[PDB]
From a paper:
An intriguing aspect of lymphocyte development is that the generation of a population of self-tolerant immune cells requires Ras activation by two distinct guanine nucleotide exchange factors, Ras guanine nucleotide releasing protein 1 ([name]) and Son-of-Sevenless (SOS).
The first structure includes the REM, Cdc25, EF and C1 domains and suggests a structural basis for autoinhibition by the regulatory domains. In contrast, the [name] helical hairpin (residues 355–398) in the absence of Ras is rotated ∼15° away from the active site with respect to its orientation in active SOS, which is consistent with an open conformation that is poised to bind to Ras. Metal ions are not present in either EF hand in the crystal structure. An electron density map calculated with phases derived from the model for the four domains of RasGRP1CEC reveals additional electron density for a peptide traversing the Ras binding site in the Cdc25 domain. This electron density can be assigned unambiguously to a portion of the linker between the Cdc25 and EF domains, but strong electron density is present only for the central eight residues of the linker. Clearly, occupation of this site on the Cdc25 domain by the Cdc25-EF linker will prevent Ras binding and nucleotide exchange.
Numbering used by the authors:
A (entry chain A), B (entry chain A): 53 to 185, 193 to 436, 449 to 593
Write the structure that this text describes.
């Protein structure tokens, strides 16, 4: 390629970038300097300061009275804005320096220069996808569903989650040394951990008899289908959940059920095993063609190792471009994946159900206590968390909303506002250890507000976020015996035994009043 | 009488006491020096030290080789032991000094002297009442009962409570300046306050309509009957409860119901009113013949005023006997009352019910909150408490026991272990604001353990003493949704949601586990 061994001054890297364009605007046949610089520059300096360098360059060249260097500069900038919009949307300082530059070239007001650097039209066209950027029919019931369907929709989820990660996110993860400041990756983490805990809690959810290990079998089948779908990350998630200490400590279940599977589990462990370092996975992933998913944990370890290996600035005082080239190559290799869409089966109701299923935040100790409570007496997804991910009430409230809307459209049959409690129980099976205190309008029928209650309570326990609809409460002295409409329990005391809602007259303990799940207009 | 103006040395008061006896043992025709000394001596010195004076006297007289002075001393002592046993039972130091004296006269072993001072036989005869020291038929239902019956049984109660107070108790109340060390008076206090609060809570207990003021009328009638029965103390209690600020603040009830009564209430207030000082009550009580009750509050104020007026020891260095005479006269006047038994109607089941009804310990603020909750917007029994009386779990546990046994014998009809919930509700009417969380063996029938539960919970709330049968509890992680067998409410949390009983498998919140009312052998 174009060659820098000891590297080069940042000023000259910029100069080269601009000189890759010509007065007519055409771009050089070899761009890789543009690519590497425009993508990686954020490690040496901020994009604001860089743009400022370009501005000093522009004022200079305009004062030199050369239309060609100005035009080239503007074409370079236009290319920056057009080819990476994301950097501009996310970065505030960059956008403000862009407005500054625009107002500068407008105040000077020389012809086409202004037209070339406009953000407005590009921004307009970017938000311009109103439409997304007869299917098939699947069921929301976990008890009867096929492991391939589960693996498929989990792969859809994981793939979207991955796609959300961008070049600049990897760059940011490299510069900040793993802060949760950058959301996309955190969401992928939540998704992985959530899948693991979903597996573990789903196994523990079933009653003491055989059935738990039947669920075990079913998740191992899901794992197989994930393997054949070449989705390695969620594969690591489900196996990592099946191999966890709390699930591994159930001997009765292990002893109950079949061998072929245990052999398969051995195979999945040995495959996914971390013997230094994940070489089995490295070669497995090597033979994979077309659609694939990275297990981005080890790849991020690779990125970090690369970042720490090479010095950012060289001892010569110049910029080390070997580093920027290497990181660009690795990150580009990763982003490359998101171009190929998954083979199959987009169904968004099941997606809604799973996105809600998979929001789980639990202590290891809690799960050990459940597992131990059920049974009296090492393949690690990590990606080691120095900090655990935390839940966002907005995405979870949307999740519940979408879940309700979907279970409504699918299973209501336009019949009343209700669905049969049998089908509901079957859907509930897909939510481990989920229960909500309520009393029902009809026997064997569930209101929309009632199911919203159930899922809101479920999500409230799962995310460990107490949340509920606002009521106007007033501390009330109850003269006749009365019970909590939230926790279904007696209000103790002589006086001031609870809180009454002014408008709807709902009765609650002080503890239950903030977390009440039902609406005030009852 | 025998005359001391400036009073006399304690040694000489003792000498006189002994000299009132003769060698043959016969007692002087005028004893009042014996009476006053033997009763009141505890204010100048303890009975132990006094007995020790008698012992030095005995050793001295025996060494003087005079059989008459020894015999007289022994006869005096025998009279002390025989005529006041209570002083000897209650006082430990006295009893031990008595054993010392007995072992002394036994070690010297001179004839009859030992026989004369023996405590054993007197003690034997004192405990010797195995029998108490066809009636009539009354009902345990408050809704239909006659004000005269209520006033009658309340008078029985108050009279027993009063009888419990002894000479030495008044003396002790005089010396310690009102410490709750002496129980009998404290019990009378509890009884008065309990009656007041029973009145107030009974009025507040009924629903918002007219009926509360009907109960008001009924208590005013009870008050009238108490007046005609010449029972002034509980009269003061019930009127004092009817005139309380919390009951007086109900205007709707006042406006609802009749005048003749309000005139009568005016009469009861003006009578019982404290205009200095209670002269109306003084003359009312003056015209009273035979059976009467003191309103011992003002009389104790009289005793205190007497005690503070006169100097214990005179400036001459001698004992002021004017004081001892005055206090003896007043206290003797009081004790005199307990000799005449009340005119009527001993029924111990209703007594059991009332003794349990009347154990109440409430904050003024609590009752103000109930009264205020029912109604949105000065004749004082006191006897001012610098310290409020506190409940004793033993007497309350016995109370419940006796209550259950009585409601069992009376209302069961030897039919199953159950009584109808209608009759039970009617009995419950007599316990204001009383409720207990349970579920029942049979619809419309109540177990003996069930009613024991109800009354134990009622008493637990009333006395503000949490109490319950012991279970062996173990902190339990519940895998399936479950509810508190005590508070009838949901057990929150992922893990460690409650406590399970090892033997009977009872489920409870941590808060409910100590206060569980049912037995473990279920
Ligand atoms: Zn509650
Ligand atoms: Zn409300
Ligand atoms: Zn409870
Ligand atoms: Zn038990």
């Amino acid at each position: 390629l174009g060659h820098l061994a000891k590297g080069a001054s940042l000023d000259d890297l910029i100069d080269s970038c601009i000189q890759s364009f010509d007065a007519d605007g055409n771009l050089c046949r070899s761009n890789q300097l543009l690519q590497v610089m425009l993508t990686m520059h954020r490690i040496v300096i901020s994009s604001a300061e860089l743009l400022q360098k370009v501005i000093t360059l522009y004022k200079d060249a305009l004062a030199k009275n050369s239309p060609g260097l100005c035009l080239k500069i503007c074409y370079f900038v236009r290319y920056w804005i057009t080819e990476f919009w994301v950097m501009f949307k996310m970065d505030a300082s960059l956008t403000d320096t862009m407005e500054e530059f625009q107002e500068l070239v407008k105040a000077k007001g020389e012809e086409l220069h202004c037209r070339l650097i406009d953000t407005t039209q590009i921004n307009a066209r970017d938000w311009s996808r109103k439409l997304t950027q007869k299917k098939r029919k699947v069921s929301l019931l976990f008890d009867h569903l096929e492991p391939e369907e589960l693996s498929e929709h989990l792969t859809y989820l994981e793939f979207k989650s991955f796609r959300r990660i961008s070049f600049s996110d990897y760059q940011n993860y490299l510069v900040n040394s793993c802060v949760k400041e950058n959301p996309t990756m955190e969401r992928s983490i939540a998704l992985c951990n959530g899948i693991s805990q979903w597996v573990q809690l789903m196994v523990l959810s079933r009653p003491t008899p055989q059935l738990r290990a039947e669920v075990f079998i079913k998740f191992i089948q899901v794992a197989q289908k994930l393997h054949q779908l070449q989705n390695f990350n969620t594969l690591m998630a489900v196996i990592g959940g099946l191999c966890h200490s709390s699930i591994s400590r159930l001997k009765e279940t292990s002893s109950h059920v079949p061998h072929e599977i245990n052999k398969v589990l051995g195979e999945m462990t040995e495959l996914l095993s971390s013997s230094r370092n994940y070489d089995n996975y490295r070669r497995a992933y090597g033979e994979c063609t077309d659609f694939k998913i990275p297990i981005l944990g080890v790849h991020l370890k690779d990125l970090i190792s690369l970042y720490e290996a090479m010095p950012d600035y060289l001892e010569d005082g110049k910029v080390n471009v070997h580093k920027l080239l290497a990181l660009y190559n690795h990150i580009s290799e990763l982003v490359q994946l998101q171009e190929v869409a998954p083979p199959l089966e987009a169904n968004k109701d099941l997606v809604h159900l799973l996105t809600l299923s998979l929001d789980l935040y639990y202590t290891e100790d809690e799960i050990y206590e459940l597992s131990y409570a059920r049974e009296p007496r090492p393949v690690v997804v990590d990606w080691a968390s120095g900090v655990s991910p935390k839940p966002d009430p907005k995405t979870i409230s949307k999740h519940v909303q979408r879940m309700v809307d979907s279970v409504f459209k699918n299973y209501d049959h336009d019949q009343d506002g209700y669905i049969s409690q049998e089908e509901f129980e079957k859907i509930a099976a897909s939510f481990p250890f989920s229960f909500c205190v309520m009393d029902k309008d009809r026997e064997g029928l569930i209101s929309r507000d009632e199911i919203t209650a159930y899922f809101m309570r479920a999500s409230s326990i799962y995310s460990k976020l107490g949340l509920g609809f606002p009521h106007n409460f007033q501390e009330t002295t109850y003269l006749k015996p009365t019970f909590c409409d939230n926790c279904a329990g007696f209000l103790w005391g002589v006086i001031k035994q609870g809180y009454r809602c002014k408008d709807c007259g709902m009765n609650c303990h002080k503890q239950c009043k903030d977390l009440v799940v039902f609406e005030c207009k009852k």
